[PDB]
Amino acid sequence: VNSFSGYLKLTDNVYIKNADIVEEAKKVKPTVVVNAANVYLKHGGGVAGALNKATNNAMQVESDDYIATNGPLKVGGSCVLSGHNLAKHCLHVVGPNVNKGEDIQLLKSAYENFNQHEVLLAPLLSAGIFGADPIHSLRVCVDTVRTNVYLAVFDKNLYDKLVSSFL
């Protein structure tokens, strides 16, 4: 049993809810929250900016030190950093950004990072300002992630469309 409440079960391991991810993390304090990161861990806007704002910029401070030591992530890659006040850990995952011309086939590689964690609170990778079709992102998630993933979709309209269209 876990603390996640109000989710729609899509499969054996994938659950979904219409929710503000900063609010859900604050309530649950999951072991792992996933950030929709870029390779520079520049959390300006999108899920990354919303999460970072909720940490009072401590996520960005920690991320800048990580990049100064290690250099940029790969598209499709990830790193584990602190979850600050939101979670034990934040898994920063880089999905391809269609608005930068990145290979959408890298979305499967991005979701494979989730398999290193037994339970996660996550957004749909490459959705929102990363420009991918969220219906596609949910299909890749279901077909790639084998660990237990709790997906938070910010937009009620999109949530209802993802559920209604789910095969």
Residues at the contact surface with ligand 4JO, assessed by CB under 6 A? 20-22, 46-47, 50, 128, 154
Residue 19: CB minimum distance to ligand 4JO, A: 9
Closer to ligand 4JO by Cβ: residue 12 or 20: 20
Residue 1: CB minimum distance to ligand 4JO, A: 26
Using Cβ positions, the residue closest to ligand 4JO within the complex turns out to be 50
Closer to ligand 4JO by Cβ: residue 13 or 98: 98
Residue 21: CB minimum distance to ligand 4JO, A: 5
Residue 46: CB minimum distance to ligand 4JO, A: 4
**Angle (CA) 87 54 36, round 5°:** 70
Find residue 81's DSSP bridge partners. Answer: 90
Closer to ligand 4JO by Cβ: residue 21 or 79: 21
Closer to ligand 4JO by Cβ: residue 95 or 128: 128
Residue 12: CB minimum distance to ligand 4JO, A: 27
